Design a protein around this ligand. Sequence first.
Ligand SMILES: [Cl-]
Ligand SMILES: [Cl-]
Ligand SMILES: [Cl-]
Ligand SMILES: [Cl-]
Ligand code: NA
Length: 129
Amino acid sequence: KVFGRCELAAAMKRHGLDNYRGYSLGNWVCAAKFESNFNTQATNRNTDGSTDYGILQINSRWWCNDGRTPGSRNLCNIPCSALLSSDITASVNCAKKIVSDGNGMNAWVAWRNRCKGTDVQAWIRGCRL
Ligand SMILES: [Cl-]
Ligand SMILES: [Cl-]
Ligand SMILES: [Cl-]
Ligand SMILES: [Cl-]
Ligand code: NA
């Protein structure tokens, strides 16, 4: 599913991601924009053989099981395919663990390089939230 911007903002807010670990909703929408272009089915292979999955490009190196990242962890205790669903619940629940691991949203390179320090509120501007 390719979310609309305000649609994703509303879904993230409903799932408790707005202001989670101090990160406003615009930060999460911006992260999803540049990680996945709002596409829940996004996947990208990393140089180490791991794969990033879903709207927040969560890495099988640590967070989910895809059966093809030998030696990796599954800290969210989910199959990586669950991060590709049209329902964002699994991605949100796992993102909450990631952003709590000590590095905040720096866990998302695209957030650090394209959202951090910018006017992230623009990503929720105009939405009925
Ligand atoms: Cl915001
Ligand atoms: Cl694996
Ligand atoms: Cl959803
Ligand atoms: Cl932080
Ligand atoms: Na894994």
